[PDB]
Amino acid sequence: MKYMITSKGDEKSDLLRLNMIAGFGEYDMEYDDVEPEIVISIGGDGTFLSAFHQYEERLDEIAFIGIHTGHLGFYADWRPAEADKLVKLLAKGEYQKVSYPLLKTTVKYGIGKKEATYLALNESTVKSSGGPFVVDVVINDIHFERFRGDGLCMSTPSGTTAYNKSLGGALMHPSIEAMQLTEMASINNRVYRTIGSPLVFPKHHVVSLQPVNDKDFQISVDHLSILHRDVQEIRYEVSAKKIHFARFRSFPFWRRVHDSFIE
Amino acid sequence: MKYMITSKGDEKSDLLRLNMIAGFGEYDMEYDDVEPEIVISIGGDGTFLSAFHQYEERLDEIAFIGIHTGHLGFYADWRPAEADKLVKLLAKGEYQKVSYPLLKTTVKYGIGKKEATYLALNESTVKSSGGPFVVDVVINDIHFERFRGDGLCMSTPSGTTAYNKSLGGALMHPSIEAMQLTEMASINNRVYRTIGSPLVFPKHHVVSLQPVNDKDFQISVDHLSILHRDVQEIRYEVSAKKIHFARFRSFPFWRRVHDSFIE
Amino acid sequence: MKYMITSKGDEKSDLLRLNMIAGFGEYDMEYDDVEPEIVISIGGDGTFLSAFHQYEERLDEIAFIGIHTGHLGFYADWRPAEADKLVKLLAKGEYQKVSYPLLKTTVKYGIGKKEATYLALNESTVKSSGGPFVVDVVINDIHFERFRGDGLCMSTPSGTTAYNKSLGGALMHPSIEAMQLTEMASINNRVYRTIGSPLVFPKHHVVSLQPVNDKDFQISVDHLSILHRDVQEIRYEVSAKKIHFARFRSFPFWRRVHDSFIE
Amino acid sequence: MKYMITSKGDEKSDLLRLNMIAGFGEYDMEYDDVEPEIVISIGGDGTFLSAFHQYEERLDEIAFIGIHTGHLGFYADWRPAEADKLVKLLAKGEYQKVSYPLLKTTVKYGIGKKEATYLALNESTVKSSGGPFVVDVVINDIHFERFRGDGLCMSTPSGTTAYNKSLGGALMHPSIEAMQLTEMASINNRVYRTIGSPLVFPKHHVVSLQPVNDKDFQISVDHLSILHRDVQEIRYEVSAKKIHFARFRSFPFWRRVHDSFIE
């Protein structure tokens, strides 16, 4: 099939990529980095996230695979020593796909800027452009809280082991179609009040962040962070789109969690 | 239809119950506390939990309703002033039902005691019988961690605003079919290691707690707490059974959260 | 004595200031905003912090007083209705002083920039200039941890009810001569490890933050935040200097905590 | 001098104890477990805590030393391989002493039971006798909060790395004369409100816990836990007494923290 391989660009990852290309040449496998059906990332989770975003417009037509040439990644979850076996099994195809949910972020502006949408595999976060971050949090059109603090983080299920975890969020199995909102350093006193707890939302729930005074915000989607100006609204919802993984063996999520954080 | 009304037993709740019975007498509504189709609880969330457990063997045939005669409850979410309207609308029926997921707890013993199962609407917790609480946590047959601490709490979605919240757990919308495990005071040092974060599990995942040395544990299910002896295993999974509520208007979960914790 | 009054600059605060000046004119009290012995701040805690920093070079010669024209402040802890009584009692003098500890922050640079020192009444924080914040944390010359995360916060005792509290830090009575370090969103996994817990340091302990790769950091001291370039070291220690308050009645710290966060 | 040695009672610890006694016999060192001047504990931190409580009535006349025959302890902080060097240096004396602060707990009863005082090296905790734990928290005679939850923990400085740490408390250098209060699972909602944050108190501050309805409590002091009945008040304050350690080299607290929790 059409495939491509992205590399972290260090010596180890580049050599593994060239060797896998040579192995794929021994099968009916065409290299095409325009319309691949298979996208292999070699490096770490950052490499894998860049691969996802390089091809985010063809997600339903691609099966992703990640190889970690450093320590075990949550997406880059296969070892370099298994690369030949990976080549053999992808070339023959007939493998099963596993799908993880994604986060849709919509940013609406004042007039002159059209709204923009972004897809996240880990999370989207919002922080101020300097000074206090203050937004009204509106859930399905219901005013829930006025948040004053450092920022907010909205995570996918597979993102829950990343920034979300450092913020106190729950780890959620990625078969759950949900998104999770965590606080960054909310103030709570006689004047200001937030829920504190992480909040877990199902599909079709919409969380809208609306500015109170300052309208400039630093918005991140996975590794990318951009200062957005004259923002009127930031809307989060579970995406209808899904990322598809090729799996060639059982490596359960909870075992990946164990392997990464416990032992 | 057949209905019954349970009361907290204070003056306010008993009088409201007698008045609602009188109002139901004005319709085709038979009082039956053996096979009710409608179970109305008057008091607080504790009253409602006792109603649920009184009828937990006929859950698929009952629609529950809670009236709070004190402050707003998460299950006792209707005001005494709306009791006449409640009577009018239940008697005519034709109302919609809302279903929340439940937690199944299985306790297995050494020989001589048969296993026991319990259903929880809020949560099930496990604590030691004195001294350190130590269990191996096994998720779908995979050894995940050895927990040493004060205890563990496994919450339903609607339970997440209760004990779970006080333990740092996420609040989850109750349409998500899941259960959530939180720690109570785990030790973490060079010898001992736990995940720390709350863990959110989907349907069909099984979490098994297995004793390491001491085999006696204090096990709670909602308000009930019993010392269990010669325990071999405690198994948690999302139940196939569901509790059904009568709803006569929109009172969204996230608005109940807001009303209870924010303002 | 020489005194001055700083105002938040809203209508309420400016009018109170002019009225207090008129009342001071009825005594032997000279207005001097160059060498005051008394510095009265009218507004909120931000106003009070700006007063402190305006006069931070004459701290041993000044008694500070804060009036809150909004809600109760932890430094602006007297009501506008008591302004006449305040005037009467300051003019006659003979009042007792209360002293709170301060935080000394030293920033050392590469060659071409001389080191700079800053005094904090609430806290000093450090965050990256974009991207991950990574520093080695060295305590009395002993390498304690490599921190990777969003940032770090070092609080005075009276600062512990401010940013420190939002970060999970302990509240400490301000008679304790100490400083407290809290984390902002540290990553912890197989590669990265931090203590997690807030750390409380006595006088003469020195905490040194040393860069690992990136050398640009956003450093804050109380309300002020500056991007510092080519930083070699950030050193924290309890200052030898103290801020002095005039007190005219008992308003215990723990009662201020209660009044601000409990009821 | 007079000395004694307490052992964990496993094979390793008993043999080390007999060998150290033999080595002490080669000097002017008399074994006396009634009035020792030196108390050596061999085992773990639990062994050391039992040694402390065995001799808590002669604390000003004793220098304690702990050897860990398992992993490094915070009190049992010397290795078995250094036992001969320990013998040599204790026998010659002339070593420096290091002192850590202690916690005084007073339990007052209804009539018929006289008040009781207890000294803690790690912490004192209070939990209910079954059901909710509810106390009024009074700080220097000022009503601070009504706590409803699982319990409360009051830690010494050297205790802050123990239970206190698992409860979210700050780690405090043990030269600070203070005690630290942490919550266990407080409920917070529209009816109930606590500070949440750990609270750090200096010497001479008194924290009084007063029952609201139930008067039976499980009170722990270090490893010991007793059910106390008809309790009227539990009072915490930093003790005037101090525990004294023999030190024969620099092993800084923050390095012990690093060695135990980081690497």
Ligand SMILES: NC(=O)Cc1ccccc1C(=O)NC[C@H]1O[C@@H](n2c(C#CCOC[C@H]3O[C@@H](n4cnc5c(N)ncnc54)[C@H](O)[C@@H]3O)nc3c(N)ncnc32)[C@H](O)[C@@H]1O
């Ligand atoms: N490039 C950087 O350095 C960013 C960073 C900033 C501050 C502090 C730490 C880092 C960090 O080291 N990053 C990578 C490590 O994250 C592991 N990783 C990644 C990923 C990725 C690529 O980077 C982008 C992601 O970084 C995260 N992130 C942002 N801020 C924080 C924070 N304060 N604490 C914790 N994580 C944070 C946020 O989720 C971004 O999407 N995905 C996952 C995952 N699903 N599950 C488990 N581990 C994951 C990956 O394997 C590494 O071990």
Ligand SMILES: NC(=O)Cc1ccccc1C(=O)NC[C@H]1O[C@@H](n2c(C#CCOC[C@H]3O[C@@H](n4cnc5c(N)ncnc54)[C@H](O)[C@@H]3O)nc3c(N)ncnc32)[C@H](O)[C@@H]1O
């Ligand atoms: N009878 C007691 O007093 C128990 C208790 C013990 C210690 C500290 C506090 C209490 C407590 O006051 N209980 C009731 C308050 O809980 C509200 N409530 C109840 C319920 C119920 C009936 O009681 C049993 C439940 O109590 C909980 N619980 C046990 N320990 C803790 C803890 N440490 N912190 C927080 N909650 C705890 C645990 O979930 C049990 O199922 N359900 C919910 C819900 N889904 N969402 C939001 N609020 C809820 C209810 O409306 C009241 O406001």
Ligand SMILES: NC(=O)Cc1ccccc1C(=O)NC[C@H]1O[C@@H](n2c(C#CCOC[C@H]3O[C@@H](n4cnc5c(N)ncnc54)[C@H](O)[C@@H]3O)nc3c(N)ncnc32)[C@H](O)[C@@H]1O
């Ligand atoms: N100007 C802003 O808005 C900053 C801010 C940014 C983000 C989120 C909230 C705010 C915030 O609203 N600020 C003021 C409120 O802080 C009360 N206050 C102040 C003070 C002051 C003046 O501002 C500067 C201080 O702000 C703090 N700060 C920075 N980030 C955070 C954060 N994420 N969460 C919580 N506090 C944060 C940090 O300590 C700075 O020194 N001192 C104290 C005090 N000793 N004890 C109790 N309350 C205090 C004051 O009375 C107000 O109620």
Ligand SMILES: NC(=O)Cc1ccccc1C(=O)NC[C@H]1O[C@@H](n2c(C#CCOC[C@H]3O[C@@H](n4cnc5c(N)ncnc54)[C@H](O)[C@@H]3O)nc3c(N)ncnc32)[C@H](O)[C@@H]1O
């Ligand atoms: N006997 C048990 O098993 C109790 C226990 C119960 C539940 C969960 C864990 C344990 C536990 O394993 N105990 C010992 C481990 O504690 C280290 N240790 C000890 C000590 C001691 C002797 O035991 C009594 C102490 O236990 C603590 N404790 C009570 N509950 C909890 C909890 N939930 N989480 C964390 N610690 C808890 C509480 O401070 C008691 O005074 N002192 C310290 C110290 N100053 N600094 C650092 N580590 C310490 C010691 O070296 C071991 O590594």
